[PDB]
Short mmCIF file of C-alpha atoms and ligand atoms in Angstrom, two decimals:
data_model
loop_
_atom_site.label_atom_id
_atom_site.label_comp_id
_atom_site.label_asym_id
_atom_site.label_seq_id
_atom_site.Cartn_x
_atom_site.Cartn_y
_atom_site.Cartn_z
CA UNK T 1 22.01 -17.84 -11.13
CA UNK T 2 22.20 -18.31 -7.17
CA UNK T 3 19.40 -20.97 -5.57
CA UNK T 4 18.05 -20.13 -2.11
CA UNK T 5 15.44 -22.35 -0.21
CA UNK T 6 13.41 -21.29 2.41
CA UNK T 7 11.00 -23.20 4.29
CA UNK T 8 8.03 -21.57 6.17
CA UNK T 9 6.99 -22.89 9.41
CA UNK T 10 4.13 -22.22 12.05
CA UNK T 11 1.34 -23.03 14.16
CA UNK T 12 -1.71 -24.37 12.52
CA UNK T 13 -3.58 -21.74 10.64
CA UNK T 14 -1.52 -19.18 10.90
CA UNK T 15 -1.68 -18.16 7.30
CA UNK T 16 1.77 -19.79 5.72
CA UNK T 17 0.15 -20.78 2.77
CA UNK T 18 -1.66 -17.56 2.33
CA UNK T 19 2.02 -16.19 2.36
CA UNK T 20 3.55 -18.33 0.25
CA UNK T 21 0.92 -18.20 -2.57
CA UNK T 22 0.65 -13.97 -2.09
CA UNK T 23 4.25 -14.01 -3.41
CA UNK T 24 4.09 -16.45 -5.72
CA UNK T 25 0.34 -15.86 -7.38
CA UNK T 26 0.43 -12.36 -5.76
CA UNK T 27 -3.53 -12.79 -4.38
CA UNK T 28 -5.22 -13.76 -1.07
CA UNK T 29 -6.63 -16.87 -0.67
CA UNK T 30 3.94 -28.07 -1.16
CA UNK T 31 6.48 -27.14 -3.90
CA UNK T 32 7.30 -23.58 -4.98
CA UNK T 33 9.83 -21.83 -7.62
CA UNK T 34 10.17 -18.41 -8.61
CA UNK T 35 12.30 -16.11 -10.64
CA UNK T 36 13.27 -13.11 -8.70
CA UNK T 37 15.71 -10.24 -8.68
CA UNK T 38 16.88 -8.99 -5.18
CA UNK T 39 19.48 -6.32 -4.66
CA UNK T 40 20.21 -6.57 -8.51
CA UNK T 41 21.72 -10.08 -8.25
CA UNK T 42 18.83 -12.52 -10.02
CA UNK T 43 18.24 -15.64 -8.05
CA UNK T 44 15.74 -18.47 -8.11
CA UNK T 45 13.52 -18.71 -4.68
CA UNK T 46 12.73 -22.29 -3.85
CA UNK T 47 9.68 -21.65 -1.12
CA UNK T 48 8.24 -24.93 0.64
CA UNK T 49 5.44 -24.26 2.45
CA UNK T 50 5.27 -27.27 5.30
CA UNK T 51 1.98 -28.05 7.57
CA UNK T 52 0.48 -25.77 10.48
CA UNK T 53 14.47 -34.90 6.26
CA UNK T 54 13.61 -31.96 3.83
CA UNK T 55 13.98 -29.18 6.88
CA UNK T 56 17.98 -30.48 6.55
CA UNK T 57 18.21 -29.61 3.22
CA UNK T 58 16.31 -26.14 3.59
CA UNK T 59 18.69 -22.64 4.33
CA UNK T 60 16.50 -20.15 5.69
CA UNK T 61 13.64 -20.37 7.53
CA UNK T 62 10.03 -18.54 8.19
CA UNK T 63 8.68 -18.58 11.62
CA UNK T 64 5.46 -17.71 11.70
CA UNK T 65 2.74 -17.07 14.04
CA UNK T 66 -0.95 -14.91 13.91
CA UNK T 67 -1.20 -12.12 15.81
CA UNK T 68 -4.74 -12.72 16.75
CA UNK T 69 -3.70 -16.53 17.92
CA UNK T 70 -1.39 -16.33 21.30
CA UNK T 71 -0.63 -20.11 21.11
CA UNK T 72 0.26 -19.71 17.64
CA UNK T 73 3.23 -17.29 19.87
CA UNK T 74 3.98 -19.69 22.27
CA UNK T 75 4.55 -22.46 19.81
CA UNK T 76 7.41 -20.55 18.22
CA UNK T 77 9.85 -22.00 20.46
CA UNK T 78 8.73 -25.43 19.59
CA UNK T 79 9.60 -25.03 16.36
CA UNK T 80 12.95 -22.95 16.54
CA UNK T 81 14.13 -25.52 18.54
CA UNK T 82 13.31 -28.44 16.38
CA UNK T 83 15.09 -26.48 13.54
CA UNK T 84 18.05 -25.38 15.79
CA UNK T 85 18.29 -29.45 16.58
CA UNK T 86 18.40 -30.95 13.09
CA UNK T 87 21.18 -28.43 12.05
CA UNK T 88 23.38 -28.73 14.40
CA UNK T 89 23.72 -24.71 14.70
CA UNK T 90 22.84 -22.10 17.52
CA UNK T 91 22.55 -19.73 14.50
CA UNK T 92 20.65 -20.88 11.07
CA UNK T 93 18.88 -18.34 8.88
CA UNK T 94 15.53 -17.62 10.22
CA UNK T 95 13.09 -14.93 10.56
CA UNK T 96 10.09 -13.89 12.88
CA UNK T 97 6.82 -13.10 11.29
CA UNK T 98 3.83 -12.12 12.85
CA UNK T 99 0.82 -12.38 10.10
CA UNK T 100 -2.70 -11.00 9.77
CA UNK T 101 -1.50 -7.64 10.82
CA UNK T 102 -4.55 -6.79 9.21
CA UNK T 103 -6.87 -7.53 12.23
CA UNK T 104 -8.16 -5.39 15.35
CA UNK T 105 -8.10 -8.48 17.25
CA UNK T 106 -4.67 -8.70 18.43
CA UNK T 107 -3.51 -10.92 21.23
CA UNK T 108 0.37 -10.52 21.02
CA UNK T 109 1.62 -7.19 21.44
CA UNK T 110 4.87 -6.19 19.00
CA UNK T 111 6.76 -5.41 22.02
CA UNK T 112 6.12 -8.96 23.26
CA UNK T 113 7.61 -10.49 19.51
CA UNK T 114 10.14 -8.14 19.33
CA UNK T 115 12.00 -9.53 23.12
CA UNK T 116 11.78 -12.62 21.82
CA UNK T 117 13.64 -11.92 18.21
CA UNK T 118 16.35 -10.50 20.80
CA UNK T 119 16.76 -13.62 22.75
CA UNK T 120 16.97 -15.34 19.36
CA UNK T 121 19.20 -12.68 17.36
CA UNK T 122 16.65 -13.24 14.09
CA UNK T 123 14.72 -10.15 12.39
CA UNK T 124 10.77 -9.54 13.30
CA UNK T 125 8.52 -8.29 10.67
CA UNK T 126 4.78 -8.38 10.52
CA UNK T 127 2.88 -9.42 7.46
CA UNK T 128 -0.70 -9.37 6.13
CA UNK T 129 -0.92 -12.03 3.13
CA UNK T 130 -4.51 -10.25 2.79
CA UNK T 131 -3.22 -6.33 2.06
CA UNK T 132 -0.30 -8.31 0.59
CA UNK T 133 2.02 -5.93 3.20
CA UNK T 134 5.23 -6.69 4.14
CA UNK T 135 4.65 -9.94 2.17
CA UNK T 136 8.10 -8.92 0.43
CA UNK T 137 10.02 -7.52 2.86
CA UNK T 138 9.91 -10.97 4.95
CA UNK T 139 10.70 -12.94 2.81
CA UNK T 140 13.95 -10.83 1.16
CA UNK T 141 14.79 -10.73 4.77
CA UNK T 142 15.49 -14.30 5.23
CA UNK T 143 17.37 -14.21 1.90
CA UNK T 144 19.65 -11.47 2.93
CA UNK T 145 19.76 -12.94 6.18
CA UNK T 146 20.81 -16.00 3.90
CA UNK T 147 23.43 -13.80 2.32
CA UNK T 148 25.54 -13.28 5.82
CA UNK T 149 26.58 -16.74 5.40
N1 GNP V 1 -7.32 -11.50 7.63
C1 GNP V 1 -6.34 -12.36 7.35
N2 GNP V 1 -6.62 -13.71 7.31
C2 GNP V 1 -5.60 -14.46 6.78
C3 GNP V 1 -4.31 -14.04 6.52
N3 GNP V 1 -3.51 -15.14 6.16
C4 GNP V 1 -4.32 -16.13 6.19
N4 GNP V 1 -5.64 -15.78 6.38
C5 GNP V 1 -6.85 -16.62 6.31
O1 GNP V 1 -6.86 -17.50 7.44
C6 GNP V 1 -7.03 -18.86 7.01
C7 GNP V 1 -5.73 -19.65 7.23
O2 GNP V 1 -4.74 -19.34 6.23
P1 GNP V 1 -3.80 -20.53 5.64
O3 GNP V 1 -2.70 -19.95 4.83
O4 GNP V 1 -4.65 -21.57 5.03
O5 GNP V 1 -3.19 -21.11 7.01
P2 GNP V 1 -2.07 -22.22 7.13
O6 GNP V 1 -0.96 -21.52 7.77
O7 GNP V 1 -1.80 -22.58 5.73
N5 GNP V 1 -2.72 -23.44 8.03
P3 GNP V 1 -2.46 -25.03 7.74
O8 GNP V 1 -1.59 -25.62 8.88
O9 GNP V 1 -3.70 -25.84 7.76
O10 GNP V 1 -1.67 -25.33 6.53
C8 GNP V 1 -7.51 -18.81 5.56
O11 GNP V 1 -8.94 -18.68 5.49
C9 GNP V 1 -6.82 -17.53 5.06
O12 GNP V 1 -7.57 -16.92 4.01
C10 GNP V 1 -4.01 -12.61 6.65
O13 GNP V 1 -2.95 -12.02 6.41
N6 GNP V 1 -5.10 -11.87 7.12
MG1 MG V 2 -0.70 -24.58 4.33
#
């Protein structure tokens, strides 16, 4: 079948392991493969889940942030950049995710993630690897996003 790797990215602590593994070992709390079937094609999802060379070599990418952690926001740009620089592309495969939807202590507002997927062109979703929600729908994103190329 078709091989896709994504690489997840974030501030420290923002819960890209807990991701990673909720899709994987489907619980709540690096190399990762995984037989999956999206869209009826069957594909294998290579996930590496990177700390809070090998970022050449991935195709889509995870950028993720808490929403109870506004640095964790702030730093997004960091990191898009660094990936936008060591691909040589104003447009790679990416999507915005804003995890632990799960809390009532929320310092970035959706409005405030959304304006900034719009200056970047990428997809915004928000994920709780605890409730497992949108767990899935992130990460077929990126491959469909993955797809347009
Ligand atoms: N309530 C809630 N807490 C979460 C969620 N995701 C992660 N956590 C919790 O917050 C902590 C950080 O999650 P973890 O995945 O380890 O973060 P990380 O992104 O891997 N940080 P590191 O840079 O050290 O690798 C853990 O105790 C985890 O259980 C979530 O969706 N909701
Ligand atoms: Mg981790």
């Amino acid at each position: 079948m078709t091989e896709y790797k994504l690489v997840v990215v974030g501030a420290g602590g923002v819960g890209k392991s807990a991701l990673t593994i909720q899709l994987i070992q489907n619980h709540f709390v690096d190399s990762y493969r995984k037989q999956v079937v999206i869209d009826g094609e069957t594909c294998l999802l290579d996930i590496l889940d990177t700390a809070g060379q090998y970022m050449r070599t991935g195709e889509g990418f995870l950028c993720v942030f808490a929403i109870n952690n506004t640095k964790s926001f702030e730093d997004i740009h960091q990191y898009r950049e660094q990936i936008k620089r060591v691909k040589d592309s104003d447009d790679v495969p990416m999507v915005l995710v804003g995890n632990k939807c799960d809390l009532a202590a929320r310092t970035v507002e959706s409005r405030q993630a959304q304006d900034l997927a719009r200056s970047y062109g990428i997809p915004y979703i928000e994920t709780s690897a605890k409730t497992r929600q949108g767990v899935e729908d992130a990460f077929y994103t990126l491959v469909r996003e993955i797809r347009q190329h």
